[PDB]
Symmetry: C4
Subunit: 201 residues, 4 copies
């Protein structure tokens, strides 16, 4: 209803914005396709909806909303239910298109990504490409070690991801410190592959 009307009205705005800034045709279609895949014809002010509720309802919703991600992520498959719930309530749903550089090597990293659906290539200067898909995560090394992105990460298909900010990452880890090790273990394997023998983890 109004959710569809909000999609339509906001897409209208986007169109006007693009025409005003004279974006080329190919990019306008890309933006079109992004809205369609990201929102599917509906837009909600989720933060204001969830804000209207209480903690327990909010908990149940984030838990059900992220059921697919939870299922496919062994980090989550197995864990303490309060840890999961704390993680989930901080995640931000993001959609990426084929070709997008989600992460650029050498930049400073402020977030990590969990793959619900899609395929990404990890491109490290100095090494071969490798691929990550459903139930993998990436970007954890900068959150753990606060240095620079050790590789680029590029979407190969439409990717539905959930991002976590560094500050949120540390908020959750200060509460469930025993869970840090799980990230670190994955991080050490990846650092080993790219020739960083790394004690900090």
């Amino acid at each position: 209803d109004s959710s569809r009307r909000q999609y339509q009205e906001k897409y209208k705005q986007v169109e006007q914005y693009m025409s005003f800034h004279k974006l080329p045709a190919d990019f306008r279609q890309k933006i079109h396709d992004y809205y369609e895949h990201r929102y599917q014809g509906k837009m909600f002010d989720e933060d204001s909806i969830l804000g209207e509720l209480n903690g327990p309802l909010r908990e149940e919703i984030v838990n059900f909303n992220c059921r697919k991600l939870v299922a496919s992520m062994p980090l989550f498959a197995n864990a303490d239910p309060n840890f999961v719930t704390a993680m989930l309530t901080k995640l931000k749903f993001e959609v990426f298109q084929p070709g997008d550089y989600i992460i650029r090597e050498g930049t400073i990293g402020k977030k990590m990504y969990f793959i619900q659906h899609g395929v990404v290539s990890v491109l490290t200067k100095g090494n071969k490409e490798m691929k990550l898909s459903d139930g993998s995560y990436f970007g954890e090394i900068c959150l753990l070690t606060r240095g620079r992105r050790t590789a680029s990460v590029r979407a190969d298909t439409y990717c539905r991801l959930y991002s976590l900010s560094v500050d949120n990452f540390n908020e959750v880890l200060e509460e469930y410190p025993m869970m840090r090790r799980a990230f670190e273990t994955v991080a050490i394997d990846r650092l080993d592959r790219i020739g960083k023998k790394n004690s900090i983890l």
Copy 2:
């Protein structure tokens, strides 16, 4: 008028959201019941409204609105009207449904709760249940001690509660440091019952 219509429009938007996210029907009904009890057909941007006023008017409005809560609460009984006002200004209104766990034993606590109307059960592994009702509060132990929750608290009825965050709690206690003692006395008696001591 527009506030009844704002409720109507908002609840349709919630229905649309639940359908999009494919939530199960009984959850959908749970959510419908929550809105009915929480908002009772009307919605307001209270932040926008209050923010259009001045301090004296907001103070007056908060005291008036919480006059029943305040009279029910022994904490406010002997108390400085400025401490009362400081507290009220910082409370967030919340409603819970029967069987909701407001608090879970073992988790980290960031808020405490005052009861305006309803009954809750305090569920402590290792001890008998106890009930709390109108004008008591709970959840204060982790705000004082920064430990884990010592008990679960479950809504037995519909509960209308006002929550106070740990940051606001400290702020107002920084301001009225004589009032910390009242909370400590209660906390101490409940720690005694569950066989705990804390220096």
Copy 3:
């Protein structure tokens, strides 16, 4: 136009809010009278208007908007034009009604007030009442000394004031440090009256 329509629509909301919370009749009329005196039938999103402009236009507007206050305040009558402009751009216009306690003794003070128009009584426990009016300011002692309100301040008439927050106060004073003395001088006179011989100033 829409400014009047926004007043009317927002006053409607207020009315609904009050009926819902069952406020008594006398207080509803007080709120009515407040809207009428504060807004005069018009409402603007000033922050969004001023946000649309640039610095120089913004400067000219705050300067003209506060012409009356500037005129009647010797602190301002005389001062460096950049200091004034910096002060003005931080002030918040507030209206108070006869009987209002603007400030309560013993509380912690986070703002001071400049009187554009109106009369206030300063009520110190332990001393006689005194009055302040157009071109006076009050509440400066807590901003300077960060302790407790040394007296209550109650509106006797409709008062049109401009408030300044402590953080804004210090922001401006870190830039124009030579202006602090002016507040301190007034503060010392008032502290003397209420029996606080005070070196901190």
Copy 4:
């Protein structure tokens, strides 16, 4: 469409505000001219729009939108495309009218400015004027040195400028510390001209 109407509705609201505050007619016309040049009949919540997108799309859009600025600016000439993107992401678009003092000698500086289109005069007490135009920047000295503005800068034409705050400047320079040198070199040459040295 709605963005043309948003301009119309917004400008009526500005007219209402100016009438309420009793601003003089020529100021009222000044403000009318500013809106015409700044917004050119359309208004958008760019924050809301961009915020609906993702990082890759916002990056693409910012680079596309600033392609002329970037090509005009020698600072970006040899530069890492990630440093360029970091900077662009932090710029705020601003327009000034002829005779506006963008900066006043002697005041405290919190921002610097890049010129996309227009000419400014640099007015230094004690020295001859100089002009700056498309692709130069100014106001960088106080961002580096945290002193007072060493000169006034006045708009001679309509000026379309992008501003960068001191906090954002440091943030991006924290990230690309090799780029600080470029700003220093310019700053040093301008300090030389006004007979100043700084260790």
